Amino acid sequence: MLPPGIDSATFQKALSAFANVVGKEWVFTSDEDLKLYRDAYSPYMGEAEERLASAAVAPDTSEQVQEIARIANQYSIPLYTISTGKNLGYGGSAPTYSGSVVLDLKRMNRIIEVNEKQAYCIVEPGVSYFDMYRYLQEKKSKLWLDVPDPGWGSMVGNAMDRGAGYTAAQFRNHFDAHCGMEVVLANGEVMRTGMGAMPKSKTWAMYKTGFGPAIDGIFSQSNFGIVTKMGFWLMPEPEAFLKGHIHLSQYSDMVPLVELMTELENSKIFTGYPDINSPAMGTPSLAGLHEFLQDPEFMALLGRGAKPEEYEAYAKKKGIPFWTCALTFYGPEKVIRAQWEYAQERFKKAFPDAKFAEHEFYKLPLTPEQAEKVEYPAQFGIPNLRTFAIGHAWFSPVIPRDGAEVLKINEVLGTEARRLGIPLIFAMIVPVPSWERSFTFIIPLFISEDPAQNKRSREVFRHLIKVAADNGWGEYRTAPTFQADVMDTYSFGDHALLRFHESIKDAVDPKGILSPGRYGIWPKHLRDKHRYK
Amino acid sequence: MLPPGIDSATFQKALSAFANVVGKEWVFTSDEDLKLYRDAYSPYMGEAEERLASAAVAPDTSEQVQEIARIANQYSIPLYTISTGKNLGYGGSAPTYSGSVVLDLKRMNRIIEVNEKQAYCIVEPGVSYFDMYRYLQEKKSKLWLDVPDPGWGSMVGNAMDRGAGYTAAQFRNHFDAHCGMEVVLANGEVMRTGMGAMPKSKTWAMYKTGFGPAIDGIFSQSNFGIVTKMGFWLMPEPEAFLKGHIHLSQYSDMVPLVELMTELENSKIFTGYPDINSPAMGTPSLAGLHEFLAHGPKEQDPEFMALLGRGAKPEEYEAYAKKKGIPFWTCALTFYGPEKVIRAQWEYAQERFKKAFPDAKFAEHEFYKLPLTPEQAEKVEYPAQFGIPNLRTFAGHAWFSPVIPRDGAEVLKINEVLGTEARRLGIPLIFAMIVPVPSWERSFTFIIPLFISEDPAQNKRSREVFRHLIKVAADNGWGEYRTAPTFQADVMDTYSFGDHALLRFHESIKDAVDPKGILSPGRYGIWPKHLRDKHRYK
């Protein structure tokens, strides 16, 4: 394959110049080698519009990255930067623009700094969560990671997509926990953000913004730069871990549950991941047994797509809670037991029929073997593959911390989803509180062996996106298939936001070589052809 | 006055067009009117380089701001946007480029939204901390502000300068607590950031980044747009407040104090402002400020005054301090939460400090069940710790506030290095030591005050000296995070990695978002293309 508008002779010269920088054994051109850069969960799998690489280049150093950018810029070669390329559900290892050369940074896997007393690290993009966890545990570090689940991927690459994990509130937002970056620009120049812009700065990983415009955010969900280094704020290993279960009896309890849980979260009574499920509706939380392990009354309810309210009588008869809220607490035993006691007192005052249980308690540190037995190792910053040890994408619109909105998005998107026949499984989609102050409402897409089905799945998802936007519910992260679809919903001021990103794109990357099309941002030379329809 | 390179007729056409938008009574041109737009604390006070304004326009609405921008862009009129203009120590109400038309947003004082249950607001730039606190207190709100001290100024204006306050760690960084913005660009278009870019978005003040590049940061310490609206995350009023004192006997205790305090902070044992001071050296503290305010001055020990008089070094106060039995260091930890929670947190902090410092002493300094009555609020040690904007410390200046790591060895190295360059020059350093200020988690600010004089010659000396201190700090990897227009180009010059890649990057964005270069020319050392060579730093 060739990059569109790039003749074969120009491409071959570009590739020879890359090989001269990184070595011929680190420039990949074969159909066999490039199959490994296909999106394993492509919603366009096997179709004309499938996103494919023209080639891949795997540099060893930031200096080589600079030289590859220089060469790409000169020859106008489109470059798609990945860190470890494990972005399954959101585009995998494939480019946003078919024909782009993948710049694969997986060899730049150096741990630049770990500071135990100040609880930070600085990492290259190739440092995986597994690499960093092994490094910290072998050093008997008292620092935790915040890891996705499962724990494949890169601290950098995950942060560049604004990914998430499951430890304390201040670390669950990976990009928000970063401090300082190094960026290579389209012209090959290298730039440090924040305090790192001062040579010999002592504070690159300690003070986020630096001096003047705070620019780090423009590189995330973006195509304005190649990130070569990133600092992260790390969570000290707490003294102890307490998970408490709150059980509520009524469907209608959701509205005051959301209000009270959000107040306690905002009051920092707990900093762990709040997990809400419905035992009555059989929805799962982080209980691992679910996949690992059938009342006729329940099965009939589930068969006829019963609404949530229809489970309340059944739940009440079986003595099953309608809602469980699991609160996680990190800190000294006496402290987290007092936080949990306060949480119970507030819930008992609001819900006189509320029941409570201590679900987990650990004094830290754990042994490797005790760690293997915790309900959800990601809550301890342990990257792991257990969750699915006994293809897809998702629409994950963000809603407020409001129970009325939890009900409205179910009522609104559940029906449009039923009309157009996406198989929603439970009575209800229960809101996910990944980050403080909002929820995500998670709808899976399943890849079919039939491209005609995949086409209808893409048309249905694009409808669900427009319906959600009409009710003020917007997506926060998506696969290339839907990136321009979602950016079109952010249309305030006649698409002011996209027109703004296009201005910065043209300033920082005038030749438009960096990850064309990423988050709906096309460089000026491709913008006419790739205007959203 | 005319804006430089603009003729009387063009200026008159622009002024007339502004008055057609905001009305004739809200366009100001007289010397007398414009005197209020001078920097009350100008380090150039009365001198030729003093930052002056050529006119001021005070619009009522964001739609009037759009039309003002359109007109200024049409006539290449340089515009300097202020919210309430209370930026004393950092430029006051004055532009970064003399002859700029001040765009004064003080009339845009609407509280767009307050949500008690989700603990947020959306405000216009004219909403002062005093206005907002009054609004919340009359409503008997269970939400707190994070306020500077003194509490004059604008939630938006202070946030746009990346200012700081004194409540819980997650609100003390005012820009970091913001969620969503509305910006008018140089061409007069309006844009909403984050989730507000979706018309009818329900999440503008709930989910910070929105979708695609997270751009809000580029408008802070910048000249890329005019901020017309901002969301803030607000702190729920906690159940209770507890402040504990840790007393340590030795100078050398600083290094492990910083280590242990930083670990407990990063472990969220406490979330309040940790206050470190030296009773022994008499360094300022929230506690010493309350005393000076309550009982006025106190008769100083002449043994203390002998040490202070001869500019004795910190180590020389240790024997004196152990004689009069006064601590060398006091660390005040502030806890917000349920009484049983904060008492347990303080108990845990005491156990940790007792194991690290077997000689440590402890006291509970302050405890309150919230809410406070108006009478208790009057009598707390430091009202800004309760989100109360106040004027107690009003009963001029600029600063060099370099940022250092949470490292005791750096705290000593910055004292030895700058507490001699300053001694070699004539800058008055009062105490034996500048004690680091933990404004935000994971760093310290090292505060050297510049005192503005009636003597212009002494203000020129002060400028030259501070420009030196900025270069010496830079050579030791200590960078300034905020400064007055006098020093903005000087500080931007220190961030020179990659042959000034950061400034050349900002200049590229400047030219894409403001090609005619009308927004706040020179702010944080960012000059538009047409002025860049003439104003190139030296």
Ligand SMILES: Cc1cc2nc3c(=O)[nH]c(=O)nc-3n(C[C@H](O)[C@H](O)[C@H](O)COP(=O)(O)OP(=O)(O)OC[C@H]3O[C@@H](n4cnc5c(N)ncnc54)[C@H](O)[C@@H]3O)c2cc1C
């Ligand atoms: C079952 C399942 C569960 C998942 N759970 C989670 C979860 O808990 N949390 C979560 O966040 N994700 C989750 N994911 C999504 C995904 O697996 C992770 O986000 C993964 O960590 C991302 O891949 P990566 O770290 O290798 O990043 P990469 O794929 O290397 O990077 C992601 C994207 O960012 C850009 N990028 C990467 N590196 C750079 C760079 N150096 N400079 C500029 N741009 C760059 C590129 O466009 C790239 O495609 C899940 C997926 C599946 C299928």
Ligand SMILES: Cc1cc2nc3c(=O)[nH]c(=O)nc-3n(C[C@H](O)[C@H](O)[C@H](O)COP(=O)(O)OP(=O)(O)OC[C@H]3O[C@@H](n4cnc5c(N)ncnc54)[C@H](O)[C@@H]3O)c2cc1C
């Ligand atoms: C004794 C003393 C103590 C102080 N203590 C503190 C303190 O504790 N914490 C603290 O943070 N500061 C402190 N300051 C500094 C200052 O008083 C405050 O930061 C003050 O709140 C800022 O002024 P303001 O809110 O009116 O902002 P403004 O002056 O309105 O805005 C600040 C700057 O931001 C830009 N700007 C403003 N509005 C906009 C807009 N809408 N769009 C684009 N750009 C805009 C302008 O360049 C403006 O000059 C102190 C000063 C003194 C003298």
